[PDB]
Amino acid sequence: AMTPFFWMFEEREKMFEFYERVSGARMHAAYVRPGGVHQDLPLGLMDDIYEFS
Amino acid sequence: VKQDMPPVGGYGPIDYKRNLPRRGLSGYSMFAVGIGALLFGYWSMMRWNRERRRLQIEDFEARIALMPLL
């Protein structure tokens, strides 16, 4: 069954865009570091997270 | 200060449980529809096959009339 692959890889791309907005890289964020995280969340990201969820 | 914060009233409810519709007719309904279609097709095929037999008999008797000259 090869249709749900294309059905949800755009949602996977949306979460890749969320990674892009929060860290600067689509896949390899290097965002979580010892001591917490590396950078704070940008303004307006959480509304996008809420809409997608 | 300004920072990424949820609003004063918070975010709205988000659906997270399964929602299947549950749709279509009852099985008796499709069984009755199929049986009725079967009966209608049987009746129409019966009538047309009887008419075809009559036409074939007519053509055969025309052939029998035409035979002696040939």
Characteristics:
part of a larger assembly, 2 chains, A: 53 residues, mainly alpha, two-stranded antiparallel sheet, B: 70 residues, 1 helix, 57% helix, rod-shaped, NADH dehydrogenase [ubiquinone] iron-sulfur protein 2, mitochondrial (chain A), NADH dehydrogenase [ubiquinone] 1 alpha subcomplex subunit 13 (chain B), proton transport, Complex I
Q: In words, what does this structure look like?
A:
The structure is cut from a larger assembly and holds chains A (53 residues) and B (70 residues). Chain A has 53 residues and is mostly helical. Chain A has helices at residues 3-23, 45-52, and strands at 32-33, 36-37. In chain A, strand 1 (32-33) and strand 2 (36-37) form a beta hairpin. With 70 residues, chain B is mainly α. Chain B contains 1 helix and no strands. The PDB classes it as proton transport. The entry lists the keywords Complex I, respiration, NADH, proton pump, mitochondria, iron-sulphur cluster, oxidoreductase, membrane protein, Quinone, proton transport. The entry is titled "Complex I from Ovis aries at pH9, Closed state".
